[PDB]
Design a protein around this ligand. Structure first.
Ligand SMILES: *[C@@H]1O[C@H](CO)[C@@H](O)[C@H](O)[C@H]1NC(C)=O
Ligand SMILES: *[C@@H]1O[C@H](CO)[C@@H](O)[C@H](O)[C@H]1NC(C)=O
Ligand SMILES: *[C@@H]1O[C@H](CO)[C@@H](O)[C@H](O)[C@H]1NC(C)=O
Ligand SMILES: *[C@@H]1O[C@H](CO)[C@@H](O)[C@H](O)[C@H]1NC(C)=O
Ligand SMILES: *[C@@H]1O[C@H](CO)[C@@H](O)[C@H](O)[C@H]1NC(C)=O
Ligand SMILES: *[C@@H]1O[C@H](CO)[C@@H](O)[C@H](O)[C@H]1NC(C)=O
Ligand SMILES: [Ca+2]
Ligand SMILES: [Ca+2]
Ligand SMILES: [Ca+2]
Ligand SMILES: [Ca+2]
Ligand SMILES: [Ca+2]
Ligand SMILES: [Ca+2]
Ligand SMILES: [Ca+2]
Ligand SMILES: [Ca+2]
Ligand SMILES: [Ca+2]
Ligand SMILES: [Ca+2]
Ligand SMILES: [Ca+2]
Ligand SMILES: [Ca+2]
Lengths: 276, 210, 264, 276, 264, 276, 132, 48
């Protein structure tokens, strides 16, 4: 075991590839559904988690492997969403004016962000390149960024005057702020309430899928405006009844799990790179 | 990118004039002027002559590879790639790159089909130029000749010529030009990528460690 | 030719067989991944088929050398001939046609399968080095068409995938800065040993001796012997080419030619 | 320099590339940004022109080479939008019921249109093919088209009764109307306040790119019902703060210019074809 | 060789000609659809090209073996040689090149045209059989590269398209289970008769006898005779290779050899 | 797939290699101090974070790299230690009677752990082997374990009555309880204020380091009695003044990071991998 | 040639190899079941591992018979050839490596190189009968 | 003598008798790195 080394591997093309693995990824892994509370409110039941578990058992997943999680709504779930769970689905209802919040959450939970803390009070923070953002999470994240000249003097804003700063997020629960990569900035953000992390984007998180339960293709995980990729795991399904939505998920759970994959950073094989 | 740029050349020169090499060449010139205005022994004498020859190499314009040349090249590469250079770094590091880069080196005096090589450590050889077989040395003749004849910085010293000629058979022209430290043939050999020259050049670059 | 080589070898003198399309390479289709993930979404490496007189090698990069130094990925491929070749006329072309269409390939382990979707960049500053005992006997830099290798035992094909500095909007859309990489850049080479000269006997596309020996062995159900592989599988015979195998192969090929001089 | 003629060039497929032209396109061209007045309204600042200019300079665009052009709104900007500039970007805040107006504007600006006059009062007009349209522009356009028989008698309309005429566009600033091809038409359009031009569709206008700041992909530049493609120059981005939108633009401006390219008809190469 | 075989045939005996790359195959590029619709959205079948010494076959399935039993789709192609070869060295490789890039192909009768968009899987458990009068003379199961056919007049290539059970997200997206099928799975084989030994006379690549004969017939505008087709089109000549036609072909070929002995 | 774990990397003992694999997904590595609040209290300053960052600039850390984190006292900081940071140092001010708490936090942070949740109120739990522990963390953990016979009857404790249960940790913010490996157990603790997790110990985390600021050497990460290895990362100093302590650390920071190694880091900041 | 000609198990001291082209040395590191306090202190179950267990073999081919030619420790043929080339500084020719470097020469020992080596070695054998 | 114009044109020619010879790129490219280049104030054409 040669952890922490890029070692090339040679593979032939005459080799007969092996048998299926769905039975393994069901008998071992743990499916994990995150739904909004309005779902259960419309269902109006409470044996229904057990009923869904039994149907998943009919479909293959053992009894204890399928686990359910609730959340009040997308904006509240946005603050520190940690899916400590093996195969994640996030049902995400779509409503007008929450397009950007939905996109931010989709980016955050679909792409593996590795990140470091930020002392707003002390340093001036600069963004390296295309894959670096600052994510601010809290109850009221009012980030006020003031850019700095090469002499460390403000433009459009006075370092001693918080008012003239340029706001780029008001009272957001989650905010992926992207600034002009190449300039020092002085931030102010309400340190008692909202934490901020200088984060950058590793490869994708291939363990979490997002089922947009509502409308059109509005998710934009890539902050770049030129590219609007349609990832395999940003699924979208129409809805008029949460029972029908859940039945669709249960019926096609094989396909959703095929779309997803085991988390790379959770593997033992990633031990000495960024294993998590 | 920098806003100051307040004559970094002059700032470097200011602390460069006071380095040991600068004051050493000044003392050498002063000593010769005083001599004019006045009126193992072999290993020690050759060590002193080697120190003087290092000063002479710094002073004068040699047509060989000139170890100081390699020192400057390594200094330039290190300075360019390194991204931590304050106001008081290029001053007091160009001086060090003059002082400590390649502390040990050797020189040659070519003379009538023979060559006399000296080393700052104390080593000293003399060998024929057409076929490399060492002949008896003459320290008195060497001390006589070193003051007037031109000195060839032995980038590729006789320790390496013997191995290289014996194993890789060399022609008279290439051997003579390597002895003369000709950059043409030195780069020709590195382009050929032969291990002896590659190893020696890497040894010198390592000796530039500071 | 065969008896002449037999005598010129019985008396210890240099021998030589002229071969048209010599199947010197054992069949080998495979790939090396210098960078991979379980999702197999951002790969980079080489693929190659060596078969008959064909080397056909394609280096691929999913990021199109986005983050490589100076936007130049470097690919190398060694091919160690089991026996030295002489006066080889070779045909070198770019754009390896085998590895030039979409595929799905079983993983190295054999567990999953990964998708390969080539878009063919031009290979740049290609160097073909023909080596004998580790010493470069010949080198050809960006010289396609027919070439000549006077004497060589190994082949090092080096090529490079350079990101296009300037880009039309279409190709820019092809190559994004993000992760998806719906298309994967590739650069390839093809090398055909049209003819050559060798000491030890081989099989050819012009001589019937291998087929004749295998046929007369298969006719009468000769049991599998010590040195020759089962059924005279030429790939397994050439993949390890011990001196005992060389001696026996020369003997049977000489008799095969002697017989083919009368029986057709 | 042998203008006018269509001579066949020849090139070798083994030549090498050349040095990047990013420096030239930053140092010689002129970037050019159109935004809605609500942008500045939310910004509520006013050395922000200078702030954006200096950020663009950090990205590599000299100070005098970036232009800003506030426009009131989509509908009132679509009335003869003149992009007399070098690298054009048009932000558009998507809103409900402006889908067709925004798509009409995008079709008008993203393609080179060759327009001849139309004397409504005198001639009866036609459409040569799918590449021909009639663009009407003015303060209030109400196009009423009456198609004709092969003997100059109306069908579904009488040639003398503008009441009998059929309305195809009503009281919009920009109307790119298409009708059946090969049938003569008699138009009535309020000539005192809405000019109309018979226009032909040349190749695409790479000089300008459109950025939908709001909702989902709707822009159908191709009037054909069948093909509803997605061009590289039709970019989309989510938003809550105009500052964040503009910072995204500045950060990814190199990618946007890569998506765009210099106008084919602005060059001496296109001198004697339809140079403009 | 030609006059020797002429004597051996005039006094009935075992003739034989060694051919490098014979034109045993009549030229035929075509396809058979074992499943089709007027919409031509969901197709399954085999395309092939027989030409000279080359065979390429490509069994394609638009559903990638979903409704098929065991997720394995069988494909079989028969090539019926007009004359039996002997001791034929045959290269056999996967991934038929010519049927691995997108095309638009006219329908069975030219009425419409259908789109073909291959994604090349690996042909699993391939099995190449060489038959003489229905008796299996040779068989090769999953053994690519050079092989040998002892004596045969029919080639039966039986390959398979196995849906990959394990699939990464990319290939999973490539192969849905609904109707659209925007990518069409394909498995191909390539088979070149590098050299062989034929009892009768055929065109080659090593020789120029057909060239000489047809050039002579074209120099003087000879009227079309009974047996040879117009212009001595080799495809039409070999598709119907009756005994009288073979006899005349042998006579003119040996005469052409006698001429080429002196007139080049 | 892997990073080529299952094939061996070869190296020559007679040859000094030259090429190195330049890789970075970062701005630059981040030194990171965790100090007790009494340090700042005794310093009685407040441009001192600025001063320390300036010192580290001399030592060779850019401004934005070095970060500082106050914690109240070691017993409080023990509860869920989030090491949000790259090169982590913890300044543990030694005091008597906190020997076990200090050693237990050191065992937690200096080692990687792989933790599953423990549904205490339903099942019974064992310990697989020497590497297993139960980590109980929260406001006030009061673990009470009761071993069970093969008949699921308690020994020394009736399985119904909870007063008879053998207490093993009494009101600790963090406790690492080891019990006899092979005995089913019933566990009782205050589920609201404390959470217990079944944690295997993987290899050591070679990233964080512990500087014991006070007196005698008492760290024992290995719960085994026989072995008490002194890892290089169990550094120690003798102190009277926190300024002197900080100057010592700054002056010798290169040696400290040489002792450590950053190649072991996790995406998330948790001190233990979580695997449901 | 891939087949086992000789095999020995737990045999030390002198042994023989009839006709062999490769050597496969397999051995094992067995953790000692019973452990005195000292060795138990040496080998913990935790990561630190201040001491690293190793098991080794040594193998000397004292003498052999080779169809082709090789240098030895009893014969000076290679020394004579190299000295004759070195004293006169022969340009490196097509076949042999620079300076008759025996390591590279045996690493790449193609038949042409073997034939040239045999020729020069037998010539040196002839010379040694008269000049020493 | 191998001679180069700065605008692409190249020549190769003997010294004793100025009879030009086919140019050898990949030999000139190797030579020019090390050898002492000479300005050509008397162009090859005028010299011939
Ligand atoms: C794979 O499945 C086939 C039948 O589908 C079965 O015969 C075979 O034994 C299986 N192989 C393995 C390794 O499970
Ligand atoms: C941000 O500005 C407010 C003024 O309303 C100020 O009180 C606060 O301290 C600032 N935030 C920080 C972190 O200094
Ligand atoms: C192209 O750019 C490189 C560095 O980016 C530079 O060294 C080179 O000189 C440039 N090309 C020309 C023709 O100047
Ligand atoms: C259009 O119709 C109006 C009546 O509604 C009429 O007054 C006007 O003249 C017509 N326009 C033209 C151009 O004839
Ligand atoms: C350069 O790296 C390669 C691995 O790609 C390694 O095999 C080689 O040994 C390195 N260079 C040297 C001189 O060893
Ligand atoms: C611990 O024991 C007390 C007293 O029996 C009980 O009230 C409490 O619920 C127990 N803890 C849990 C988590 O049930
Ligand atoms: Ca948000
Ligand atoms: Ca402002
Ligand atoms: Ca950014
Ligand atoms: Ca985007
Ligand atoms: Ca009407
Ligand atoms: Ca309109
Ligand atoms: Ca129309
Ligand atoms: Ca359309
Ligand atoms: Ca504790
Ligand atoms: Ca008790
Ligand atoms: Ca235990
Ligand atoms: Ca212990």
């Amino acid at each position: 075991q040669n952890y922490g080394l890029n070692i090339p591997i040679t593979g032939s093309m005459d080799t007969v590839y092996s048998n299926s693995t769905r039975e393994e990824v069901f008998l071992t892994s743990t499916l994990c559904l995150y739904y909004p509370t309005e779902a259960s409110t419309q269902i109006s039941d409470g044996e229904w988690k057990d009923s869904l578990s039994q149907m998943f058992l009919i479909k293959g997943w053992p009894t204890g492997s399928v686990y359910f999680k609730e959340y009040s709504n997308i904006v509240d779930f946005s603050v520190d969403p940690q899916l400590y769970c093996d195969y994640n689905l996030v049902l995400m209802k779509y409503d007008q004016s929450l397009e950007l919040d939905m996109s931010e959450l989709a980016d955050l939970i679909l792409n593996e962000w590795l990140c470091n803390p930020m002392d707003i009070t002390l340093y001036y923070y600069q963004q390296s390149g295309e894959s670096n953002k600052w994510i601010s999470m809290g109850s009221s994240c009012t980030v006020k960024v003031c850019p700095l000249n090469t002499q460390t003097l403000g433009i459009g804003c006075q370092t001693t005057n918080v008012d003239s700063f340029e706001t780029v997020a008001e009272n957001e629960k989650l905010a992926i702020v992207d600034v002009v990569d190449g300039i020092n900035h002085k931030i102010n953000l309400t340190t008692t309430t909202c934490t901020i992390r200088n984060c950058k984007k590793l490869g994708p998180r291939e363990n979490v899928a997002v089922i947009q339960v509502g409308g059109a293709n509005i998710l934009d995980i890539t902050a770049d405006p030129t590219t609007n990729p349609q990832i395999e795991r940003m699924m979208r399904v129409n809805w008029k009844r949460w029972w029908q939505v859940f039945y669709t998920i249960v019926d096609y759970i094989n396909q959703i799990v095929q779309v997803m994959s085991k988390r790379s950073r959770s593997l033992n094989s990633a031990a000495f790179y960024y294993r998590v | 990118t920098i806003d100051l740029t307040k004559s970094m050349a002059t700032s470097v020169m200011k602390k460069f004039r006071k380095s040991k090499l600068a004051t050493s060449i000044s003392e050498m010139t002063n000593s010769l002027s005083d001599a004019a205005s006045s009126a193992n022994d072999i290993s020690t004498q050759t060590s002193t002559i080697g120190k003087k020859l290092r000063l002479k190499e710094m002073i004068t314009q040699t047509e060989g590879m000139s170890f100081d040349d390699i020192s400057a090249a390594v200094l330039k590469t290190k300075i360019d790639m390194s991204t931590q250079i304050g106001k008081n770094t290029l001053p007091d590091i160009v001086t060090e790159a003059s002082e400590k880069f390649i502390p040990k080196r050797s020189y040659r005096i070519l003379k009538d089909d023979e060559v006399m090589e000296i080393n700052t450590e104390g080593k000293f050889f003399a060998y024929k130029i057409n076929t490399f077989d060492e002949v008896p040395f003459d320290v008195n003749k060497f001390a006589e000749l070193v003051t007037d004849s031109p000195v060839i910085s032995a980038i590729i010293d006789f320790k390496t010529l013997k191995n290289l000629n014996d194993n890789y058979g060399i022609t008279r022209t290439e051997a003579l030009n390597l002895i003369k430290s000709n950059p043409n043939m030195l780069r020709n050999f590195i382009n050929q990528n032969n291990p002896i020259i590659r190893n020696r050049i890497e040894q010198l670059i390592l000796q530039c460690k500071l | 030719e065969y008896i002449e080589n037999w005598n010129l070898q019985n008396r210890r003198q240099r021998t030589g067989f002229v071969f048209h399309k010599p199947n010197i390479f054992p069949y080998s289709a495979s790939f090396t991944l210098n960078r991979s993930q379980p999702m197999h979404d951002n790969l980079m490496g080489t693929m190659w088929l060596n078969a008959g007189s064909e080397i056909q090698v394609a280096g691929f990069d999913y990021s199109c050398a986005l983050n490589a130094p100076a936007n130049i990925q470097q690919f190398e491929h060694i091919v160690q001939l089991r026996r030295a070749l002489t006066t080889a006329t070779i045909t070198l072309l770019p754009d390896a046609e085998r590895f030039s269409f979409p595929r799905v390939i079983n993983s190295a382990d054999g567990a999953t399968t990964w998708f390969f979707n080539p878009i063919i960049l031009r290979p740049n500053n290609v160097e073909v080095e023909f080596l004998l005992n580790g010493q470069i006997i010949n080198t050809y830099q960006a010289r396609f068409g027919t070439i000549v290798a006077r004497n060589f035992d190994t082949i090092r094909l080096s090529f490079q995938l350079m990101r296009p500095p300037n880009m039309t909007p279409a190709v820019n859309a092809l190559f994004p800065q993000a992760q998806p990489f719906q298309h994967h850049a590739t650069v390839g080479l093809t090398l055909r040993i049209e003819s050559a000269v060798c000491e030890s006997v081989l099989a050819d596309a012009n001589e019937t001796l291998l087929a004749n020996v295998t046929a007369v062995r298969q006719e009468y159900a000769i049991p599998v012997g010590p040195v020759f592989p089962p059924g005279m599988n030429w790939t397994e015979l050439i993949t390890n080419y011990s001196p005992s195998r060389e001696d026996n192969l020369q003997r049977v090929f000489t008799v095969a030619s002697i017989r083919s001089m009368l029986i057709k």
